[PDB]
Amino acid sequence: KETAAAKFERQHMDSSTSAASSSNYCNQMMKSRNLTKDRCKPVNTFVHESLADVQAVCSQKNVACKNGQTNCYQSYSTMSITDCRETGSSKYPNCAYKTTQANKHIIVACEGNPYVPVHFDASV
Numbered sequence: 697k698e699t700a701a702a703k704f705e706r707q708h709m710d711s712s713t714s715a716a717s718s719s720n721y722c723n724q725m726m727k728s729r730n731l732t733k734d735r736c737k738p739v740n741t742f743v744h745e746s747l748a749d750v751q752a753v754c755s756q757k758n759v760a761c762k763n764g765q766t767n768c769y770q771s772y773s774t775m776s777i778t779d780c781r782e783t784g785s786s787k788y789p790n791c792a793y794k795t796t797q798a799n800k801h802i803i804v805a806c807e808g809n810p811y812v813p814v815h816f817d818a819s820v
């Protein structure tokens with residue numbers, strides 16, 4: 697089945713755009729990337745950087761993840777991200793999100809060999 701590394705690219709990477717261009721970005725991306733297939737995922741962040749720059753975070757500042765694991769890493773630099781959060785009108789299968797564009801450091805969890813991101817922990 698889909699690997700954790702591939703799932704991270706499908707749910708969190710958007711190298712094709714530098715930022716969200718309209719308030720409908722989240723609604724369109726959450727549906728196209730199949731994140732709303734089974735239910736409305738409540739929160740999801742998309743990163744507008746090259747995949748190589750995001751994979752490189754696995755060799756940057758080590759930090760504990762929110763849940764305590766120690767395989768988390770914080771990017772040294774800020775990155776262009778789009779934060780998607782479910783709105784009060786969201787109702788499966790018509791999942792609805794608020795689009796927020798920002799520049800923040802990202803924290804991801806890394807695993808395997810090659811050592812790559814497999815989970816998005818937070819934006820700070």
Ligand SMILES: Nc1ccn([C@H]2C[C@H](OP(=O)(O)OC[C@H]3O[C@@H](n4cnc5c(N)ncnc54)C[C@@H]3O)[C@@H](CO)O2)c(=O)n1
Pocket residue numbers: 707739740741761763765766767768805806807814815816817818819
């Ligand atoms: N600002 C935010 C806040 C939350 N989120 C998303 C990221 C998460 O999904 P995902 O990246 O698939 O991660 C979940 C998967 O990762 C796995 N996982 C969790 N911690 C891990 C760790 N330390 N090492 C490896 N895998 C881990 C469990 C599961 O399969 C989800 C809940 O944390 O919400 C976000 O996009 N932006």
